[PDB]
Design a protein around this ligand. Sequence first.
Ligand SMILES: Nc1nc2c(CN3C[C@H](CO)[C@@H](O)C3)c[nH]c2c(=O)[nH]1
Ligand SMILES: Nc1nc2c(CN3C[C@H](CO)[C@@H](O)C3)c[nH]c2c(=O)[nH]1
Lengths: 263, 274, 295
Amino acid sequence: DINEQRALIKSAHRYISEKLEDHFSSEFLPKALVICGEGLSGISTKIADEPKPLILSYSTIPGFKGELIFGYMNGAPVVLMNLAETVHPIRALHLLGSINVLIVTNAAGGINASFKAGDLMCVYDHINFPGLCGFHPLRGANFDEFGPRFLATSDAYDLELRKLLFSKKKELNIERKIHEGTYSYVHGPTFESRAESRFLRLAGTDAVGMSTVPEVVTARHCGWRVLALSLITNECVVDPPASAHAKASKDVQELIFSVVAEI
Amino acid sequence: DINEQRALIKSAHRYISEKLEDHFSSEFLPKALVICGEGLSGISTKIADEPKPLILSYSTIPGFKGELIFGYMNGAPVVLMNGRLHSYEGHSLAETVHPIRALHLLGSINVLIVTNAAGGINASFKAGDLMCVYDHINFPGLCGDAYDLELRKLLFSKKKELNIERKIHEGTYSYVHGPTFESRAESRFLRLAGTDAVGMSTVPEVVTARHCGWRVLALSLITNECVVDPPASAHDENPVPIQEGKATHEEVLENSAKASKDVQELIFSVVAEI
Amino acid sequence: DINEQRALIKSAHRYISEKLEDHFSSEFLPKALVICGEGLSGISTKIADEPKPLILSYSTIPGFKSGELIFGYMNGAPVVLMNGRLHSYEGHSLAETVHPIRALHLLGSINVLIVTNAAGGINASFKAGDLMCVYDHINFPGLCGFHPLRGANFDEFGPRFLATSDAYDLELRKLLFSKKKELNIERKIHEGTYSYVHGPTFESRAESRFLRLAGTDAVGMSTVPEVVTARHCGWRVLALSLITNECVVDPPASAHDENPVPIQEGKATHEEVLENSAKASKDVQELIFSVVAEI
Ligand SMILES: Nc1nc2c(CN3C[C@H](CO)[C@@H](O)C3)c[nH]c2c(=O)[nH]1
Ligand SMILES: Nc1nc2c(CN3C[C@H](CO)[C@@H](O)C3)c[nH]c2c(=O)[nH]1
């Protein structure tokens, strides 16, 4: 089972390595992988027209099940992504020997009382609720060539990358609020109850969603640095029920566009 | 797979719709489904003996893994689900909610009335109280407006009109997988999470009923107070035995049966104004 | 499937029952199952060389998914040792990880489970090197559907619905502290609540903070599914955790911190767990050696 998993990752890398060589005149060794969140696929527009970026549909990459975009962004070579199957790409791209940072954005509901729709949250910690229970990207035989059997997550979110994100906001004069908080991963509907939202808040949750965390864990297992940004799309209602008696994408675009330059 | 799953739902509806036409001279279009939990099978007697009710066994209905009772209750056409399926039995969440989807294809049901036993997490609850659910926590669903306010006002008005002295709390129901009863720390955790009562059922049916567009009224029978005190320490010279006050299935059964009569009358009054 | 599980259970029992009769001139009726954590394999040394102990590899036992069962006498008492355990993060089902308990139960002699593990310290007063006698647990994955009793009930072993507020026998814990005093062991043995999480990641800061407010004193990746299964069989349970590290719970350094603490500082490692488990192993082996003689 892991053997077929291994070959599918090698097959996917073999394909991507070949197309890169055939496409780019210079050896394209991307320093970053950018996971464009829900409604943040415009980031591909900030890719440079010269050299001509390479676009690979997932349909043509072995093992994959969406497109991969290999180009330059503010001068830096990057990859764009527009449970072991959702993290098969990170392992495949890792075999290029060049990526050392994952930048992942997402939409997230606000659980911290001080958050409002439109605010941003720079993720500096997470709660992987399915991972605690048995829905884990690392469950099963360990990929020894990639990382250790037991991986620490208390160092998941690189401090220097977050300090860089905040400097690029002040430089870009972006007024939008950006917080620093914990992101809770639930495999549960945004249709969370008010009691569920309340439990999450007291559980130590600042923003909540259904993404990012499995990719963060897989990247950290591969040794990459991780920078994670959340767009607070709504404020989760946490009050008890009645008793019977589109602009922020631009800011996220420019913030990343600046950050990738100094990676 | 969803296609072969959709065929079973359609197959179940075709079966049930066929039997209703054969059995009832007049068209039978039930307005509410009543899922009877632990010890609420006495509601079957509140079904009018005329017109003669139709009884369908699960083994005979396609897709079902207990019996369906179709009849009139306080003048209203209803379906009784005698015997529910539980996730702790190994079944998938889809199998446990397939009956709701099959019955939804009749186009007439618009209310789910569901009861179940529950352990009391709210410290002021006692065995014998009921809890009108107005919110829930779906623990298996997450880490792995739903309760119609007017039906809740209807329930309390029917308690006052029937002069039922039994307490009826309003609070949050926590759905956990079971089949273990909670350890002391788990209950203390559920309490600080905002739990009022905890059970091993109901929330999947509620979520499926809301998906079908049904109004939902959920009533929890508090059969026991969850043990929350830390256990006896090995340094205690006068320790409370760790077995003291432990939950049992027998306690759940007995306390459910004692509250059945009040619950049956409460539902009997509710369906008439549904 | 339960019928497939039963045949597997009876098949493993018939296998073990046979090799017990061929090997031991006397009838070998073990009274306790000892599950040895990682780094606690030294307990196999306290098994007497006479009568000759029997060793069955998991590879040969049907159902058992290198790990081995050691059948012998410890402090004169007949015991069975689970040298190495199965973990859910390896890809096994909880039913597979606790299948050995069911098979051994069919010998009709074991009424005590002694289970050891390593654990990170969530209780802030804990330190690496301390022991924690378990007197309660939090089975959060069980609350969320990952439960060893999920599926059709083994009606020949125990009830469909099982209380866990009485999971950790009181006399067995008093006996453990009695043996600590009797042996002049100076190591700290706390009493507290163990929390089972799936792994294989070590906890994030926020995850550990969630465990603390939830009532956790020590967090590990094993034990509870075996304890639940042993209780379902009607066994008494003594569980001993080894505090191998102090979970990092402080929030990570903020971007606005002028003098930030390195986020890697204090990070848990597997080397740290193995090495601290190895240092406290002798005390643990001798505690268990004394206890098995009085169950
Ligand atoms: N989790 C939980 N459920 C219940 C229930 C609900 N049902 C009680 C019945 C027998 O245990 C199962 O169908 C679950 C009553 N008391 C409790 C309790 O203390 N805890
Ligand atoms: N979850 C968790 N488990 C452990 C354990 C128990 N196991 C011991 C082994 C060492 O990495 C892993 O399987 C975890 C020791 N320390 C910790 C900790 O901090 N956390």
